[model samples]
Target: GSSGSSGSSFQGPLDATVVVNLQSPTLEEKNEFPEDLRTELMQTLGSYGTIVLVRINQGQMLVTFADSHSALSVLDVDGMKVKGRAVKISGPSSG
Candidate 1:
């Protein structure tokens, strides 16, 4: 009998969700329209692709895209400034 070798491949780091840091101290305050921020985020980056979901709690936010590539595309806008705060965007599994 003869033995054969095997090869393997993997695909990862293609996350559909991204974490966003608003870098705002006021966010911890209970008096503001976080909804407005969510809306603005949608419009500002909506050009890339469809945003499936947006979740925010106590200032932390996460955005999900319908397409994985959409999540990858927004990395270019990582340090974009919005309103008076700077935004930090990164993939869910990114280092």
Candidate 2:
């Protein structure tokens, strides 16, 4: 029935900075991509500079850092293609 609700609230300086962490694909372990490919992904993602930490688990990855603008910028990269499923960003709660 699509009877879901979504709401958001913000508290802090209007220009306050925010950071988000992105979780990698859960099927990375099974993909078996080459190390170079993996490295390339990291390098490309790192170029944004907003990513403070990037952790790659068996089938998951986690990225944490500051700067909401920068975080969103990185997420928008075409080559990165982290929009729908491959990656998921976890943002702060309004509560």
Q: What is the lDDT of residue 24 in candidate 1?
A: 60
Look at candidate 2 and tell me the lDDT of residue 42.
57
Q: Model 1: runs farther than 4 Å from truth?
A: 1-15, 27-33
Instruction: Give the Cα lDDT of each candidate.
Output: 0.65, 0.45
Candidate 1 residue 74 Cα shift, in angstroms, is 1.0
Backbone-clash count (model 2)? 0
- lDDT per residue for candidate 1 within 1-95, as digits (tens), equals 23333222233344467777766646332443366666888777666877777766565567777776666567676667777667778656735
The most accurate candidate by lDDT is 1
Q: Write the per-residue lDDT of candidate 2 for residues 1-95, one digit (tens) a residue.
A: 33343223233322222322234534443454335444565565666654455565454445554544555555455224443325434333365
Task: List residue ranges in candidate 2 displaced over 4 A.
Answer: 1-34, 78-95
lDDT of 1 at 31: 48
